[PDB]
Amino acid sequence: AQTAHIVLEDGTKMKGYSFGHPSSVAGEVVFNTGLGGYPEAITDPAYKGQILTMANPIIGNGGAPDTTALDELGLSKYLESNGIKVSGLLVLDYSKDYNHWLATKSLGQWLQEEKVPAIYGVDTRMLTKIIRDKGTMLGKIEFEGQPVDFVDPNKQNLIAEVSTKDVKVYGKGNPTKVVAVDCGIKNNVIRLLVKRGAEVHLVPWNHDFTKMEYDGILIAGGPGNPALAEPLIQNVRKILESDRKEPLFGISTGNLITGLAAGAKTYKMSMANRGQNQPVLNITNKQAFITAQNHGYALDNTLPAGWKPLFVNVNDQTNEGIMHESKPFFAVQFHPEVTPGPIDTEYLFDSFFSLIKKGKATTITSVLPKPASRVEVSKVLILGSGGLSIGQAGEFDYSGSQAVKAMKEENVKTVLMNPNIASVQTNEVGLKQADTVYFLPITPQFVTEVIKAEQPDGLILGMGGQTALNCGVELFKRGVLKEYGVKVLGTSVESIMATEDRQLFSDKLNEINEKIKSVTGWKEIEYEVVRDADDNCVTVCNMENVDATGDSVVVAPAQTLSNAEFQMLRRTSINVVRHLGIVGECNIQFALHPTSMEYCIIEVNARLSRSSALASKATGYPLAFIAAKIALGIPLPEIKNVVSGKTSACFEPSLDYMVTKIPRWDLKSVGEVMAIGRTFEESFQKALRMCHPSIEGFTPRLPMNKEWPSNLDLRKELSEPSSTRIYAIAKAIDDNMSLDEIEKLTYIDKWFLYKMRDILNMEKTLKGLNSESMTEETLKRAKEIGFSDKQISKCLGLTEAQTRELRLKKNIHPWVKQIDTLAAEYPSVTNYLYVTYNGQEHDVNFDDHGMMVLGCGPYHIGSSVEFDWCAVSSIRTLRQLGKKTVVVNCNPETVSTDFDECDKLYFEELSLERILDIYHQEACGGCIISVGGQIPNNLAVPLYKNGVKIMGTSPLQIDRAEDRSIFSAVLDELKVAQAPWKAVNTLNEALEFAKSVDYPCLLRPMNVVFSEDEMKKFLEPVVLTKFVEGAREVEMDAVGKDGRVISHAISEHVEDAGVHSGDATLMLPTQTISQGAIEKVKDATRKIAKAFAISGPFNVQFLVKGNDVLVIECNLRASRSFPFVSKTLGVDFIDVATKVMIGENVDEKHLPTLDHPIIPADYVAIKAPMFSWPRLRDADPILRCEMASTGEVACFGEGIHTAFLKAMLSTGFKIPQKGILIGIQQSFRPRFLGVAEQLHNEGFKLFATEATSDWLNANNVPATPVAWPSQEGQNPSLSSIRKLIRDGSIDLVINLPNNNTKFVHDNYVIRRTAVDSGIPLLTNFQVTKLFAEAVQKSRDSKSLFHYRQYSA
């Protein structure tokens, strides 16, 4: 593998691998931040004599096009000149394998044919930072045995070198004669002239054209110092001084030449302008445009008499164009022909031809638009995250806090609605805290009441998800917003409705020739677009789905598009967004045909979404904040880019890294991860690891250590989207199925599959090696494509720890880099970071020595938004005590990953390897593992053995408390009772245990076991426990200090113990627990805290039956109920815990200690899941139907009954008042008849399947019979459930657990129907009793929340 160095004149050397022509070359080293269009870019004549450093880390994906083909004009069909014009090329990663429908060969082959040197494996970000702001950096690509000297190609006249040597004519026969002066013109200039009716006479740079006949003249170019082109400058000067009045249009070099000819000065810029995201402002009318630029010389801003500036650079104030005051002469410094780059300024060609066609010495101003007073807002109502919408069920969006922040900076008063009293959104005490908060449901009724009370003049309805949008739209339609004088801020409701209705949407798009059948196998691309009130419009992020709504593997930026495809879609995005009148943020999704330019629009979303959140996290561009400012009528150029500080929101980010997002499935998605790397492979393997700790990376092995079935149909597994498809792909490759076949079956673009094949080949290479034979080079490469020490250890036969030691002995370690939004074009002081093996330096200093706080990882069942609240509180406590903080998390749906709230944010893996990397590189003073759920807590001991100082409760004690055997022996000694239990190995040991304590029994890897047969199936180390029947469950949440409980709260589950404890509804304080049991609970907690020397948060769960109290388990960390308990009691338990763990003294006088609890007297609090849905055990271990749930709603009420009803309304349900479907197991009839009568006596009409209806009627409780879903149409007499739910006859379903395998399917269907129709579903008897009691006591709805003040 042949190597070479890039060597700069300042001494910098980087070693890389040759992929072009293997010979040395010297030139000016430059960088360009444009991501797309490398084939077009490297044929730009402006690069003559230059060694080009690419910002885009991943280069070569589309190979090289047909480089010999000509179009009808005799120009290169696919390129911008007749060959590669760069002197050399520097890239981070070169794709050897390419895949694109226009590709004819690899980029390397093309570079070899053209004799151009190129190396990969160099840190292009570091190069960019070195080159930046130093006028001319000279360098060379040097091969061993081929030494060269530094040379500056700008000292020769490069214009002359690239110019045509003879006159050439394009568009022969066309009616408008245009002379084009070739100073290194790009082909697209000619294409655009000819398309507009020009016969183009392309003349040499030094051709005396001054006496030629022509209708118009254009001067275009790229390379070199324009001052060396004196003969051309002289000739242009003769035109300027003659009586000739033909329009003159200068492009880039043309701006410099025209300016020089007129008497202006040029200089070499210390910071060149080279990218596709260069914002310019039209000085006359203030319109902004994104442009492509590639120039290193500029015009002095002091112009001679008769000339005026036309465009200015928004970032650096340099001239971007000029015009004559009265004659049709003008020029621009940027390239409106782009290729590559944004098609935003092509209208300048139209302008040119208009000047020619009119032809009475008009000015440029008169053939461009003229200049145009904004919305005045004193108080704004922001609709926060709310309850259920049909289809968008379980969605949450806390971006309203960024809106609050934006409004505050503009001195606008804020009112926020969010019904959850323990929401992270309302756990804010600074700039993100609303002036007034209403804890009311996001529904039209309640929103109307807040409007009456507060009289806001503005409403924000697009930052609280679907429910908030629907609520706002509904209020508009009813005339409520008009009646109270409330302006919808941002995109109007008319426009929103057009995006929400498919027909209206189709109609609107047809007015601009865009349209909308099967598009499976098409590439799915999305763009995030921002548009301000003044019609400025930028694309902030683009994304490509890897596989085949929002449950895909996604990468950003898109990887497999050409410039032409990317810019065509971008352009359409911008047109659609303008035509719809978007004022704010917008998401647009496209399907693109994989082997042509055909596309269509799938949808547009005019509210903040998952995509907009992903885009902000991926880019560092704060969409929600900016959208809120835009809603006040502030234009993009008047808003600051908070990452660079020095520039504005009016730009398109360039990324010098790649992002991978992967859904987290329940082991249909429950959460997501995002990883950052500088190869696809690094990003991708990281993201896979982030999903679950049992996933090693990209391998042919399944999560959770499961083995593949023996009857596996691999082709079938590939052709069906599922949560394990990625592992199946790895298997298919490993079993030597061709990539073409895999592509056919999966629709995954082959480019991604080549990367996946490369990972598997590295695994094979590693398996043949050992700790003595593996070279530095191979290990380096493995780490650069995302291999963990764990993966490597398995291949080499070592432990993880030995592998880490081996790697550090070779001094192979990762590097900390900033996400700066600009690919280092400008220095950033951002503290938003990631870690990569693909680099040669760190972007920050390591002098803070801060306190590390570990986040929770992806959300999933049992691990939700509650840990986000805990992180926020802990981080804030540290900051308020003046402690520096380092936060680590990889969950892009979290609020706590806010780089403004901590001093360093690492958006990184929560593995032992990566946490050690960060901790030791920062030399942190400590690490808090207690506030991020299970992930961080399981790392306690490993971290401790690797030099990490864990704060609070010792890791040795955590290990003891969570080892079941040791924990259980400690309880015995303390005389604290527990549920009898056993660890079993043999199936027979299970029967022996079950025998000695009776069925049913519980199982942990939590599932119930009714019979011995059922036990037999489950083993396809396992713990068995007996729970008592009819027990209550109680949670103890507490904070210990030196083994003493200094804060505690006891909550009672509504549900009897047994049905999973993590979706249980909690009541605080307790409702039906005896006083003696409470005392025993306290006493057991006292002893437990002392036995494990607790300093920090902890949780203990108990079974209570009468006076019997049994410990179930102890978690030596904060639990999901810490926020609930804190808000209910008026004391932040995390703040107390964080203080204890870092040794900050705390006053116990007013805390809820065991001796003096805090027990609310005037109110009760309830915590319930936000969303619940049924799941069928179709996997076939047992046939059963369970509920799963996620999210949180917490409310206060005078008692638990009114709290419960408030929680039902807060989740977005209507309190039932018409009819109830009753489904119960036959054996449960005697126990249910009482509640059935009670519901009926409240006026509910009862419905049930036939046998149950007959049973009710025979017991004098009236009931109407209905059909089992599987038996509909077998009896016309009986009505269908679906129909009765649709007519509104049934507005509540009770469906209690049912073991009868005959009706498990129907019961699942019934449950699914209730959920899909948005009506409350009760699946537990105690909950059902609570509901029946509550409707008895209650009335209407507004009365429950009636401005009650809750405290103490």
Ligand code: NI
């Ligand atoms: Ni410029």
